[PDB]
Design a protein around this ligand. Structure first.
Ligand SMILES: [Zn+2]
Ligand SMILES: [Zn+2]
Ligand SMILES: [Zn+2]
Ligand SMILES: [Zn+2]
Ligand SMILES: [Zn+2]
Ligand SMILES: [Zn+2]
Lengths: 267, 267, 267, 259, 266, 266
């Protein structure tokens, strides 16, 4: 095959439409179960709150995996990490109900101390093999200037575990105990700076904010002076791109493009 | 807030001007103490020495933290790394003297073995909590084609530790022994390929090249024949941008932009 | 020196041709012996197998280092990783014979578990010092969207060990046993999205393909329907850049550009 | 011995009488392929005949156990896997979980605890057997680590906050009834294996890669000598020995050496 | 010493004249001591007896707790974070009863205490800060001890005590004004090799309460197993020096913690 | 082997006839040995007497030094890089005295010796290169030994000796001309379980001189404690074969380093 095609532009198009069968018109259409992976309690809400509701409404079962416990996120000398993490499990539960979310896996790695290792991959893979989701959502680990290791690591570990979920020699005790390999249908990266599919959340904006604000520990009135406009600015950045007021941007690519693809950046 | 603005561009401008209060006019003016982080003995001077002189002239206290010991930087099969490190400590003390630098914290990690971990984070956090600096300076860890692990790691660990210095649950024994949280005012990344603030160093250029030359173990006469050109070529690169002879570039962003900010790259 | 030059652009042009005597015309010119470092069995052949016959042909001796054993690359519940690794070693001997490669170093780190550590650098440096190669080939670790850690790590470890191979205090027991430091002449990165030297492989394409196809375990008929077009599309992407139908890309820079070079993107 | 005797008989209710009798499912942990056969083949066989389900966990692949330069470690691990399957068949074992850590590189870490605990919660065994990590002069890291990790994992399998995703996917806590340590120099229960010794040796010889005729010249003496060491202690010819203690004597018990 | 007869003579002269080592009341001169425990409740269980007796005699007693106790529950409905908050509360109530008013909390998670330079720097930081006279810890060589946190605490405590004296160890401490400190003595509790016992039958009852303040750790149902276990543990030590209830420690010349092949003779 | 009656008979026949193991003179056939030390001075202190004896007799003696001694000082004005420069010179002197031809410096930082495969690869690489007949290292089971570097040195040493024969172990050595090697004996010094003692009564004075050559460790002051200690150490070993000054070693047949429940009987 492909001995025929004449330009690169030509082969690239044929590969996308015909070989890979991939398009960006309604990438989430047929998902009946998806998992949203967040580094810290509040990240799903913030990165894709509107889309989670949208999917919630269409009847999609939306599941969280939360990588860390949020231990470090207070400036109050009187709040111990253990208590803040107690507080933040409730904030998250409360936030996910607003968004239609009923299941949350807590891995309970400590905030700022999320390892990048096989051990974590095995955590993610166990849950992916158990639940068999059609879709996985995670942070874009390639986001420029992203300076939180827990965020970078969560992106990389998400993509990797999605891929290694199909591989029966990866974490082989799972297979030995009933958990078969699983091939996730797609991946979508939020908190991305090269979105390629964008979702209209203009009519969910206000709900999204309410779901974000239920993380009270994290957004006091003084923090909210800064963050509400930040959040609106981000949502506008994404919206302006499909000509609407508030958007949530995602990056989706054929599985193949995640590996040895010198033209992954064209889509 | 920001419910009344039509465009992303106006939200962007509003965010930086009204909500953040961020300009590139004289980012360093209010500085009475700064810490300049370098991976190896000689990096403050090579990337930032001109600017260090200038800040010193104003009576801004300049404290160095040096990550490693330089143990590896020689091709001489009869120099042992121990001897090399001893030397480069003296060489750095000279250089530092020329620039009005009178405090060096040596972390003593071995050259090419600087770790990326919480441990080294606590070192930087301990030293930030005690000197309470206004500014910290560090390499840009996203510098393209940067192949030295010590350089990437210091850039990241430097940015993270500025953030984590503010958190009392992080490295919580510091609090316990009377070192309290500290908020740093600015981070300026040097060795950057996306500077947004330039400093004129045309006059002080020769005192920079002598601060550098004092690293005699590194800059032998033969090797000054490759490096002098290279060093002047880098100073022009930054210079051209504000129309002077010799410049040193820095990237400075609001702290918010180091996290989840997909248009971080527009400043 | 370089006190006479008037613009950055001039200094840059002068630094390149006069100081570093750097050209893209033929970099693989004087190569007597070269090392191709691959992350898995099959990468040398997929990324640069055309250039590898083109190198053999001119009597350049080509040596593989394979970082991993490729233990995880199958969806077949039948095949244990141990058996796969075996099958794959055979496939790699067949693939290399076809391309005229008569030496392969197997590090045997397990697939998906290749460490990023000093210990792996010592392996590469041991091989490097021993074979004293003029040329080293390795994956671009900065290929965007590259999601295999083993790939990223192979690229970074390769460049760092080329550099560290020159340092006597580095892995100092190699010296005390009769391996002297060694300076490689060039590094070329393959699997790159920013090549700056292309090799015409139009005549050899069916050869590269057959050698790729020799890794049967990886390329079944049903997978070949996707990968053949992918493969052809990649070489087309490289061709168009120099006018021919099929090419293989490489990026090559002056040694100096791998460190603190804010203008390294300009080649 | 006024307080000691009473704690042991009226609070923890423990004895060296017949501790295995209650069992239905036991797990036998070996560092490498052959260690169960070597360390407790006689008892495995016994238990198997008496109706007990015996499952193996092998920590490593045995990748390193050859002096032949022509044999790659991947081949050897394949070989050694068919040797253990052959060896275990002889002894009536039917499931072997393979961890596949590389021989010589068994980590000592939470991650390995999590494999052990996942299987223990899965299999709900009454008993677990493991090497005594206190065997004086034991110089193999894989051996010491297997012992420690086995004991730790047994203790943590019961704790809902340890490896908590197991819970969330339906593998509940489990409480093993006893731990038995083989390859121990301080045994407090011996098992008669004179009836079963040639079979043991045959289950042992099934690891052909390991026991050539040349090596067997050195090891059949070694192994006959070991099982006399234990058997003598109860005045029979051939025994395999075990250390069993009540769960509590593995923690802050300064008198644990008196049993 | 190039003059003594048998090794037996030289031994006693080394103890007696060079190191001036004796066990009559090694705790006699102590103004400030650190007690290091792997998990909250360990100081109490193993040595609350002595802790009371020392707050009394004017000793400022400082706890270091290595972990947070996150794991020590069988209740499926208690999250690890809740447990830790509770045990922190329980420990403050147990510290109160014993005359302790300062606990450093390292906060490494239960079952995940690292054996590393990093943890050493944390002990060394607190030791250089408080310049204490003696440190207490678990004996890391306690036979059959199966809990990694307990062993590691014993090993790291002794190492950090020795490394505290070294200015090139964690040099940044010095650089910011935490200077080297030499501890005067170490004493290991939770030991099967005690060489000094403390009489605590006067306080055994207070001790038992200070332990019970760890409600999460001790149901009424579980106290059925554990109090007789503690009573039996207190006898082993109690008999050795004459009395009904005892607390054992092992104490050595500092020299004995290195390359000392006769160490078990004391 | 079915012909035996008691374990004791079994044990003696395995020892004399199967293993060919005796301790009458374990070092007699040595043409080259490696002595592995955690820090500079440990070879001298532990077995310097026996090293002299071995050099005198024509045996090529090699050191491997695990670490650089960077931490060993109280002087808040002496940096660790300096100390290591200084300590290496101090080692070169010491060695000259015992007739030691050669030192490998591994240069891991004092107090930071890793316990990992990486360090085994270092030792395996020097063992395969030198093909020594005997390897000496500290006994890692020395009771109360509290220095991580000494424990880890002993363990890595024994393990690397065994792994040195395994061609799949550190496989790039084989591919570069470094074949496996099978060492003849291991001897453990700093042991509390010697089974062979060398009489060093004669060479005792030169040993304290080879030791004092490490000026940085052994000021006159500290020496007022250490001459006694060292003399007491040599007597403990001496007074077991009834001589004045001894150096002790533990030697066991290779087989006893693995799954051997009666190993403490030899
Ligand atoms: Zn977050
Ligand atoms: Zn540098
Ligand atoms: Zn690959
Ligand atoms: Zn084994
Ligand atoms: Zn405890
Ligand atoms: Zn030492």
């Amino acid at each position: 095959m492909f001995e025929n095609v004449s330009t690169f532009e030509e082969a690239f198009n044929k590969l996308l439409k015909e070989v890979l069968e991939f398009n960006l018109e309604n990438p989430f259409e047929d998902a009946k179960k998806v998992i949203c992976i967040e580094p810290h309690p509040d990240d799903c809400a913030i990165g894709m709150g509107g889309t989670i509701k949208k999917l919630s409404d269409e009847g999609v079962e939306v599941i969280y995996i939360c990588m860390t416990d949020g231990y470090m996120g207070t400036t109050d000398e009187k709040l111990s990490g253990h208590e803040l993490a107690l507080i933040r499990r409730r904030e998250e539960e409360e936030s996910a109900k607003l968004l239609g979310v009923r299941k949350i896996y807590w891995l309970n790695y400590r905030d700022t101390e999320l390892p990048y290792s096989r051990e974590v991959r095995k955590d993610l893979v166990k849950i992916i093999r158990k639940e068999k989701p059609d879709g996985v959502f995670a942070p874009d680990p390639w986001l420029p200037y992203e300076s939180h290791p827990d965020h970078r690591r969560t992106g990389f570990l998400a993509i990797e575990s999605v891929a290694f979920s199909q591989l029966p020699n990866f974490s082989n005790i799972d297979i030995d105990i009933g958990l078969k390999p699983h091939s996730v249908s797609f991946i979508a990266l939020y908190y991305t700076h090269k979105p390629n599919y964008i979702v209209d959340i203009t009519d969910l904006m206000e709900l999204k904010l309410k779901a974000i604000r239920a993380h009270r520990s994290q957004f006091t009135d003084d923090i909210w002076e800064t963050w509400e406009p930040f959040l609106r600015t981000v949502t506008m950045f994404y919206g302006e791109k499909i000509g609407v007021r508030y958007g949530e941007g995602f990056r989706v690519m054929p599985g193949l493009f995640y590996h040895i693809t010198p033209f992954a950046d064209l889509i």
